[PDB]
Enzyme design. Sequence first.
Site, PDB file in Angstrom:
ATOM      1  N   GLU A 158       0.678  -1.007  -0.033  1.00  0.00           N
ATOM      2  CA  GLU A 158       0.176  -0.075  -0.006  1.00  0.00           C
ATOM      3  C   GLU A 158       0.814   1.455  -0.178  1.00  0.00           C
ATOM      4  O   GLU A 158       0.490   2.024  -1.071  1.00  0.00           O
ATOM      5  CB  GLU A 158      -1.234   0.119   1.647  1.00  0.00           C
ATOM      6  CG  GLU A 158      -2.178   1.195   1.411  1.00  0.00           C
ATOM      7  CD  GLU A 158      -1.943   2.209   1.397  1.00  0.00           C
ATOM      8  OE1 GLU A 158      -1.289   2.491   2.591  1.00  0.00           O
ATOM      9  OE2 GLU A 158      -2.038   3.201   0.910  1.00  0.00           O
ATOM     10  N   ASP A 206      -8.352   1.264   7.639  1.00  0.00           N
ATOM     11  CA  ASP A 206      -7.153   2.346   7.317  1.00  0.00           C
ATOM     12  C   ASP A 206      -6.908   2.220   8.204  1.00  0.00           C
ATOM     13  O   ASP A 206      -8.093   3.539   8.600  1.00  0.00           O
ATOM     14  CB  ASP A 206      -7.135   2.799   6.173  1.00  0.00           C
ATOM     15  CG  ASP A 206      -5.408   2.712   6.179  1.00  0.00           C
ATOM     16  OD1 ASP A 206      -4.667   2.904   6.956  1.00  0.00           O
ATOM     17  OD2 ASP A 206      -5.192   3.152   4.719  1.00  0.00           O
TER      18      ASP A 206
HETATM   19 ZN   LIG Z   1       0.758   4.654   6.305  1.00  0.00          ZN
END
Ligand SMILES: [Zn+2]
Lengths: 343, 343
Positions: A158, A206
């Site tokens: 990511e 997240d």
């Molecule tokens: Zn991060």
Amino acid sequence: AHGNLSNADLEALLHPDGDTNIQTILAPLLRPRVPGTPGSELVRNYIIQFFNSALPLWTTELQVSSSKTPVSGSQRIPFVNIIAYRSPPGLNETDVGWLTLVAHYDSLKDPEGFIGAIDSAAPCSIIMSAVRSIDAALTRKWDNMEQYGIQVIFTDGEESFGNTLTANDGLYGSRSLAAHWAVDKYPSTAKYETRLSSISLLVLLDLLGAKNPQIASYYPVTHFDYQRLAALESRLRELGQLKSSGIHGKSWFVDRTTDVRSLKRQPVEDDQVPFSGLGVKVLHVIDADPTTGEFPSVWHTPDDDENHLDFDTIRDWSLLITAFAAEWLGLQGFMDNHHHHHH
Amino acid sequence: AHGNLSNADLEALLHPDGDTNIQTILAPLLRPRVPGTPGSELVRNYIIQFFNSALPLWTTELQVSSSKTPVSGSQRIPFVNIIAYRSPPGLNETDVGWLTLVAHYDSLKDPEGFIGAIDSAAPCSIIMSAVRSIDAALTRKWDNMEQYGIQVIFTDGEESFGNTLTANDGLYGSRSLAAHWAVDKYPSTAKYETRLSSISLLVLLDLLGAKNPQIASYYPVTHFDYQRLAALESRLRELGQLKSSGIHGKSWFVDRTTDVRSLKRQPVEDDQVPFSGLGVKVLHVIDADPTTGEFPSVWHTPDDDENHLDFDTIRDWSLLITAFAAEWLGLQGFMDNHHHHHH
Ligand SMILES: [Zn+2]
Ligand SMILES: [Zn+2]
């Protein structure tokens, strides 16, 4: 699809194993896990082994790619996404729609030693804990028996590597997976056309684990799912099942009363973007000030460590995601975890 | 990459053929062109033939897919993207970065007979006209000779079909193309890895041809390109080469002074989204109020026809996109279109 959870269903969410708690599941994740490094392999195999031992009815798979990065020079860095899924029995897997829960398990490379406890070790443990809790109920409801399964994706790569904003930097695992699953064609006879099209709902977690998160709704097409999530939170708060909030605590879900056609927030670039761009319904659960768009204060600093995690908030998240998944899968009436032959 | 255009270069932008003007190029597009219909094939083959006759050094290609839609029942509707490109000679095409100019050529299905003159017939004619003007200069500068070519994509199936907002409705052509070009792997020896990765800059034109457009900057990563486009507009306005604006007219580019890190606008879902999600740099030139986000008044009404087009605005757009492409390709000094042996 989805069902409706009674207040009784909400009081039976925790898994029967008290010895395997979120701190236990989280701890082996809280280490540097940069892609291509030994720490990445250790964390990845911890996750795989967790599913293989505690969730043995689930199938685990890896999607592997490699890519040059702004800091790798001529060398390709590998990116390994972890997929686990469980589908109802005697169903063609190619006819199943998947509730798909996601978090990234890689960690930022700079500064050296960065832990990323909210980013996204804690999200990963929330998913792990929640699907553990719903697996027993899924077994109960499938023994009684509809065309929906449950899927988790821990994405690699990511985090971006370069100093400067660069379009093809970051989201290495999510871009590869979406790109590959979009070309994974099912048989003509199957109900779904591609592996990507079988994703019924992608929920991306997240930057969770800090106190007092603020969660906006970013995608009209999943605003109803968002409102269902906020309702479960509100109900849990009332029933007093939430540890991080009193019965009059403020709701984390700031857009809960906002009309779908009144939703005007810029999405946060993250792992849901490749999927959303190819037509997947995505719900993005990320802590960020709804106005400025700025992340929790510890974001990308050394203070994003275990000592700054709020474990009451993390437990509330695990309970909330369990409740959301159970409603979505229609597990109402199957959450009892009392044990037979025990008083 | 890019160059810098002198004021002289800006005064030589129009193509030498006065008889082939934008009204001429636009007119055969202003007909219903729903995907899968005879009007789609007529418009598509008009575009292909335009490139094949007027731009014979360009290679044309079609990317074909099919997909069920909310209104097609069991039948698959075909979606045919049109690609044309020209690369410098004696270069491996797999080593070329492409300036890629895009507009959708399909038209909305409901209401019957919808024309979509700004949506996006006029954008399509702007691209066609502009690459015609720069082709002569490209020949001049390549005869003198760097690793960049020019590419156009007319996308099919942009418009959604269903009554209600649906994640996999719409963007049929752009999702398929991005998805396929992302898996079109070049040789290991090539400078670029995939056909998608060879896109250096994707400029998407949409909803142009109405008076007084407002163009916001939606992508930080291309804000500098945006500012270059706005500069060319300003300079053209000063030099008086703009027909739709006096020397003191307001600039269309509302974000031109905004700092890249101060850009806070929600993107408009459109054909650039699949590409952007897979890491392409995209610049989205679409007329829309910068605040509310609402489109021109004729949008998706029967009044989006030729009678409501502003042809002075359309000519200004063609000149502007010609100037932008010429700067990006570094054609400074090669724009003279005077004819030899003629006084
Ligand atoms: Zn991060
Ligand atoms: Zn339209």
